[PDB]
Design an enzyme around this catalytic site. Structure first.
Site, PDB file in Angstrom:
ATOM      1  N   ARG A 131     -25.615  43.413   7.645  1.00  0.00           N
ATOM      2  CA  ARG A 131     -26.249  43.307   8.963  1.00  0.00           C
ATOM      3  C   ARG A 131     -26.571  41.846   9.295  1.00  0.00           C
ATOM      4  O   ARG A 131     -26.622  41.455  10.463  1.00  0.00           O
ATOM      5  CB  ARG A 131     -27.533  44.142   8.972  1.00  0.00           C
ATOM      6  CG  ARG A 131     -28.172  44.360  10.326  1.00  0.00           C
ATOM      7  CD  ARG A 131     -29.112  45.562  10.274  1.00  0.00           C
ATOM      8  NE  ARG A 131     -29.994  45.656  11.438  1.00  0.00           N
ATOM      9  CZ  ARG A 131     -29.823  46.517  12.439  1.00  0.00           C
ATOM     10  NH1 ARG A 131     -28.802  47.364  12.421  1.00  0.00           N
ATOM     11  NH2 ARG A 131     -30.670  46.531  13.461  1.00  0.00           N
ATOM     12  N   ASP A 132     -26.802  41.048   8.260  1.00  0.00           N
ATOM     13  CA  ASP A 132     -27.108  39.636   8.440  1.00  0.00           C
ATOM     14  C   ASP A 132     -25.903  38.835   7.966  1.00  0.00           C
ATOM     15  O   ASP A 132     -25.890  37.608   8.024  1.00  0.00           O
ATOM     16  CB  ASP A 132     -28.347  39.249   7.628  1.00  0.00           C
ATOM     17  CG  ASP A 132     -29.616  39.931   8.127  1.00  0.00           C
ATOM     18  OD1 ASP A 132     -29.716  40.181   9.347  1.00  0.00           O
ATOM     19  OD2 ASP A 132     -30.512  40.217   7.301  1.00  0.00           O
ATOM     20  N   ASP A 139     -35.462  35.902  22.030  1.00  0.00           N
ATOM     21  CA  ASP A 139     -35.886  35.317  20.763  1.00  0.00           C
ATOM     22  C   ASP A 139     -34.755  34.689  19.954  1.00  0.00           C
ATOM     23  O   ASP A 139     -35.012  33.858  19.076  1.00  0.00           O
ATOM     24  CB  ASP A 139     -36.627  36.348  19.912  1.00  0.00           C
ATOM     25  CG  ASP A 139     -35.833  37.638  19.709  1.00  0.00           C
ATOM     26  OD1 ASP A 139     -36.259  38.400  18.824  1.00  0.00           O
ATOM     27  OD2 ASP A 139     -34.827  37.898  20.405  1.00  0.00           O
ATOM     28  N   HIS A 140     -33.514  35.075  20.255  1.00  0.00           N
ATOM     29  CA  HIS A 140     -32.323  34.569  19.565  1.00  0.00           C
ATOM     30  C   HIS A 140     -31.066  35.292  20.078  1.00  0.00           C
ATOM     31  O   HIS A 140     -31.153  36.229  20.885  1.00  0.00           O
ATOM     32  CB  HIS A 140     -32.442  34.802  18.067  1.00  0.00           C
ATOM     33  CG  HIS A 140     -32.591  36.250  17.714  1.00  0.00           C
ATOM     34  ND1 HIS A 140     -31.530  37.131  17.731  1.00  0.00           N
ATOM     35  CD2 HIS A 140     -33.687  36.993  17.428  1.00  0.00           C
ATOM     36  CE1 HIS A 140     -31.966  38.353  17.473  1.00  0.00           C
ATOM     37  NE2 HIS A 140     -33.270  38.295  17.285  1.00  0.00           N
ATOM     38  N   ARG A 191     -37.684  50.581   8.620  1.00  0.00           N
ATOM     39  CA  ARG A 191     -38.885  50.080   9.265  1.00  0.00           C
ATOM     40  C   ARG A 191     -39.292  51.031  10.390  1.00  0.00           C
ATOM     41  O   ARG A 191     -40.168  50.716  11.201  1.00  0.00           O
ATOM     42  CB  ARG A 191     -38.629  48.674   9.816  1.00  0.00           C
ATOM     43  CG  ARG A 191     -37.635  48.620  10.961  1.00  0.00           C
ATOM     44  CD  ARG A 191     -37.775  47.333  11.761  1.00  0.00           C
ATOM     45  NE  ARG A 191     -36.739  47.229  12.784  1.00  0.00           N
ATOM     46  CZ  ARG A 191     -36.102  46.107  13.095  1.00  0.00           C
ATOM     47  NH1 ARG A 191     -36.396  44.978  12.462  1.00  0.00           N
ATOM     48  NH2 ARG A 191     -35.162  46.115  14.032  1.00  0.00           N
ATOM     49  N   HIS A 214     -26.718  37.882  13.937  1.00  0.00           N
ATOM     50  CA  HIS A 214     -27.178  36.999  14.994  1.00  0.00           C
ATOM     51  C   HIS A 214     -26.242  35.810  15.150  1.00  0.00           C
ATOM     52  O   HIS A 214     -25.356  35.591  14.328  1.00  0.00           O
ATOM     53  CB  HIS A 214     -28.566  36.470  14.656  1.00  0.00           C
ATOM     54  CG  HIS A 214     -29.604  37.537  14.528  1.00  0.00           C
ATOM     55  ND1 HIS A 214     -30.851  37.300  13.990  1.00  0.00           N
ATOM     56  CD2 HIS A 214     -29.590  38.843  14.883  1.00  0.00           C
ATOM     57  CE1 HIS A 214     -31.561  38.413  14.017  1.00  0.00           C
ATOM     58  NE2 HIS A 214     -30.818  39.364  14.555  1.00  0.00           N
ATOM     59  N   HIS A 245     -25.918  44.660  16.913  1.00  0.00           N
ATOM     60  CA  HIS A 245     -25.840  44.637  15.461  1.00  0.00           C
ATOM     61  C   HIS A 245     -24.752  45.585  14.968  1.00  0.00           C
ATOM     62  O   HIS A 245     -24.388  45.555  13.790  1.00  0.00           O
ATOM     63  CB  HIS A 245     -27.174  45.070  14.859  1.00  0.00           C
ATOM     64  CG  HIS A 245     -28.090  43.936  14.532  1.00  0.00           C
ATOM     65  ND1 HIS A 245     -27.697  42.858  13.768  1.00  0.00           N
ATOM     66  CD2 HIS A 245     -29.393  43.734  14.831  1.00  0.00           C
ATOM     67  CE1 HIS A 245     -28.719  42.040  13.603  1.00  0.00           C
ATOM     68  NE2 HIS A 245     -29.759  42.552  14.239  1.00  0.00           N
ATOM     69  N   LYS A 257     -38.529  47.268  18.070  1.00  0.00           N
ATOM     70  CA  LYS A 257     -39.131  45.955  18.286  1.00  0.00           C
ATOM     71  C   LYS A 257     -40.646  45.993  18.480  1.00  0.00           C
ATOM     72  O   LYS A 257     -41.236  44.982  18.846  1.00  0.00           O
ATOM     73  CB  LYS A 257     -38.492  45.258  19.491  1.00  0.00           C
ATOM     74  CG  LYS A 257     -37.051  44.797  19.282  1.00  0.00           C
ATOM     75  CD  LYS A 257     -36.864  44.045  17.976  1.00  0.00           C
ATOM     76  CE  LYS A 257     -35.406  44.052  17.555  1.00  0.00           C
ATOM     77  NZ  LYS A 257     -35.136  43.041  16.508  1.00  0.00           N
ATOM     78  N   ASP A 317     -41.789  43.318   7.938  1.00  0.00           N
ATOM     79  CA  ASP A 317     -41.466  44.568   8.610  1.00  0.00           C
ATOM     80  C   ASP A 317     -40.581  45.550   7.831  1.00  0.00           C
ATOM     81  O   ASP A 317     -40.901  46.732   7.751  1.00  0.00           O
ATOM     82  CB  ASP A 317     -40.873  44.288   9.993  1.00  0.00           C
ATOM     83  CG  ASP A 317     -39.559  43.558   9.933  1.00  0.00           C
ATOM     84  OD1 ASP A 317     -39.201  43.027   8.858  1.00  0.00           O
ATOM     85  OD2 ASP A 317     -38.882  43.524  10.982  1.00  0.00           O
ATOM     86  N   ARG A 318     -39.490  45.088   7.231  1.00  0.00           N
ATOM     87  CA  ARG A 318     -38.639  46.015   6.493  1.00  0.00           C
ATOM     88  C   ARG A 318     -38.969  46.141   5.002  1.00  0.00           C
ATOM     89  O   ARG A 318     -38.240  46.807   4.263  1.00  0.00           O
ATOM     90  CB  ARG A 318     -37.174  45.624   6.660  1.00  0.00           C
ATOM     91  CG  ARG A 318     -36.509  46.243   7.872  1.00  0.00           C
ATOM     92  CD  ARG A 318     -35.019  45.906   7.903  1.00  0.00           C
ATOM     93  NE  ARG A 318     -34.458  45.989   9.249  1.00  0.00           N
ATOM     94  CZ  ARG A 318     -34.164  47.128   9.861  1.00  0.00           C
ATOM     95  NH1 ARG A 318     -34.373  48.291   9.255  1.00  0.00           N
ATOM     96  NH2 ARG A 318     -33.657  47.106  11.081  1.00  0.00           N
ATOM     97  N   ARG A 348     -39.549  38.812   4.386  1.00  0.00           N
ATOM     98  CA  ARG A 348     -39.846  39.306   5.728  1.00  0.00           C
ATOM     99  C   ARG A 348     -40.597  40.612   5.519  1.00  0.00           C
ATOM    100  O   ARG A 348     -40.140  41.485   4.786  1.00  0.00           O
ATOM    101  CB  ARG A 348     -38.577  39.534   6.533  1.00  0.00           C
ATOM    102  CG  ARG A 348     -38.886  39.786   7.987  1.00  0.00           C
ATOM    103  CD  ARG A 348     -37.665  39.653   8.857  1.00  0.00           C
ATOM    104  NE  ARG A 348     -37.652  40.683   9.891  1.00  0.00           N
ATOM    105  CZ  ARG A 348     -36.950  40.607  11.018  1.00  0.00           C
ATOM    106  NH1 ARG A 348     -36.195  39.550  11.265  1.00  0.00           N
ATOM    107  NH2 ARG A 348     -36.992  41.599  11.892  1.00  0.00           N
TER     108      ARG A 348
END
Ligand SMILES: [Mn+2]
Ligand SMILES: [Mn+2]
Length: 508
Positions: A151-152, A442-443, A189, A460, A405, A334, A261-262, A259
């Site tokens: 995903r990243d 935000d990006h 998340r 991203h 994504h 979000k 959140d997840r 990070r």
């Protein structure tokens, strides 16, 4: 009540090439007119411009942190990178305390984390540092439970990370890959406790697809069309068929994700004395020395290797300080960024702050429902605007990022178009109310969902984000960064800006 609203189009950036660019290919009548009829500019939402190493793409945490802070917020990735570079990583008392625990009580050390160099939730190089440190500290038994990315980074790139890791394990002389799971299960998340449980039971009970070779496991998943991100929590087994390792009582766990959140969900499953989300089974592991790379939440009964530093006077706090009423609104995906991260990593609401959570569609992936809940979010907020209760508003439209994504063009284009439609309704309601809107992002992400060869691009981008201030008669500077958004809002709100906020209003 003339509201000033900050609208964040999540994953909506500006990129010239139209190939694979759902932002450019989408029909955005609303966005376009505002861009043309109102003052605009672009901002740097990546690299050092937002507290990240140069080159590193941005993201929601980093992005919402910087937007709400009104200053360049030093990020975790950067910080830890420096720690490793300055030889401070190896002197971390939390790491050493966890290592002493396994040695002293003769147990095992378990390393949790996103296996890739995405740098958004972790970096594989941080795992190697722990492996090198464990070897240096004489930790006999070290087990790796990797969460596959996709995903990243590339959708099917795990094989190279697994390979690189295996090579590092051999070089350092410690480590054993025990389990492999898609971040879909191990890093949820959305409180989808079913996904979480799957990861948990593979880790502590050794339940799930079993393989003797990490790579054959991956090969098999790809064979069934299941890629990195969605790989079923699998278990590596020894020659005797037994799991390589399962988390047991008094074992130590170092979750090298920075990070929150997840990371909170699975972290709670492990450290929570009383846990109800699901049954952990009577023999579930207890007395685990749990280490979080950075702070995840107060709930996680564990230690924090890199302690946090307060973010004072973020826009949420300055608005509150001046008796203004603010509202944070967004759908599930979000909601944590429009609240937690926007508030400078603060959990508790500010006095005067209201929040609306709209549930995202009950779909596995959002390419199956590109409009997600964009329409419910718009209806709920449009109501709030009719009521005339808020001075400031922070709205986030997750669609571009969430379906972008997926690495799919049509769905992402549909997503972008759905939001444009909604965006027009919101900004038009604001203006009719005599307020002003700050349309931004935000990006990037949706600006590139296909690689040059046409393959899925699931991460991203590093492209600049758009900035529109629906206030005729003004001009906006150009070398802006996200950290300049808050000051602009306070400027528009005519509220004084704190010294903490080192950013500069984009208004000339
Ligand atoms: Mn985002
Ligand atoms: Mn994203």
């Amino acid at each position: 009540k003339k509201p000033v609203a900050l609208i964040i189009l999540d994953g909506f950036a500006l990129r010239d090439e139209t190939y694979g660019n759902a932002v450019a290919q989408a029909n955005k009548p609303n966005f376009d007119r505002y861009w043309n009829e109102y003052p605009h500019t672009t901002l740097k939402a990546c690299g050092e411009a937002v507290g990240l190493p140069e080159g590193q793409m941005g993201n929601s945490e980093v992005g919402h942190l910087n937007i709400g802070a009104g200053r360049i917020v030093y990020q975790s990735l950067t910080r830890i990178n420096i720690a490793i570079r300055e030889g401070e990583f190896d002197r971390n008392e939390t790491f050493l305390a966890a290592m002493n625990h396994v040695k002293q009580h003769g147990t095992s050390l378990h390393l949790f984390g996103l296996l890739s160099d995405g740098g958004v939730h972790s970096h594989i190089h941080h795992l190697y540092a722990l492996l090198r440190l464990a070897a240096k500290e004489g930790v006999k038994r070290v087990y790796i439970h990797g969460f596959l990315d996709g995903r990243d980074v590339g959708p099917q790139t795990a094989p190279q990370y697994i390979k690189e890791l295996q090579e590092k394990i051999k070089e350092y002389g410690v480590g054993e890959i025990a389990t492999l799971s898609g971040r879909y299960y191990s890093m949820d998340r959305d409180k989808r406790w079913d996904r979480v449980e799957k990861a948990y039971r593979a880790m502590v009970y050794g339940e799930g697809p079993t393989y003797r070779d990490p790579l054959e496991c991956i090969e098999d998943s790809y064979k069934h069309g299941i890629y990195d991100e969605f790989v079923l929590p699998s278990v590596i087994v020894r020659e005797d068929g037994r799991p390589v390792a399962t988390i047991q009582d008094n074992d130590a766990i170092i979750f090298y994700n920075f990070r929150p959140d997840r990371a909170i969900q699975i972290s709670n499953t492990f450290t929570n004395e009383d846990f109800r989300e699901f049954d952990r089974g009577p023999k579930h592991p207890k007395h685990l020395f749990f280490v979080c790379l950075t702070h995840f939440s107060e709930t996680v009964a564990g230690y924090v290797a890199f302690k946090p530093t307060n973010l004072d006077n973020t826009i949420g706090e300055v608005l509150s300080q001046h008796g203004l009423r603010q509202l944070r609104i967004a759908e599930t995906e979000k909601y944590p960024h429009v609240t937690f991260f926007m508030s400078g990593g603060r959990e508790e609401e500010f006095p005067g702050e209201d929040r609306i959570l709209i549930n995202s569609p009950k779909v596995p992936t959002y390419d199956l429902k590109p409009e997600m809940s964009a329409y419910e979010v718009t209806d709920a907020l449009l109501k709030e605007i009719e009521a005339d209760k808020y001075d400031a508003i922070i709205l986030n439209y997750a669609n571009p990022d969430m379906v972008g994504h997926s690495g799919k063009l049509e769905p992402t284009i549909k997503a972008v178009e759905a939001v444009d439609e909604c965006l027009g309704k919101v900004v038009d309601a604001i203006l009719a109310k005599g307020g002003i809107a700050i349309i931004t992002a935000d990006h990037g992400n949706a600006d590139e969902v296909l690689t040059p060869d046409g393959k899925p691009q699931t991460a991203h981008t590093t492209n600049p984000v758009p900035v529109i201030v629906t206030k005729k008669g003004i001009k906006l500077r150009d070398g802006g960064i996200l950290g300049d958004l808050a000051p602009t809002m306070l400027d528009l709100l005519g509220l004084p800006q704190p010294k903490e906020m080192t950013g500069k209003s984009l208004i000339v």
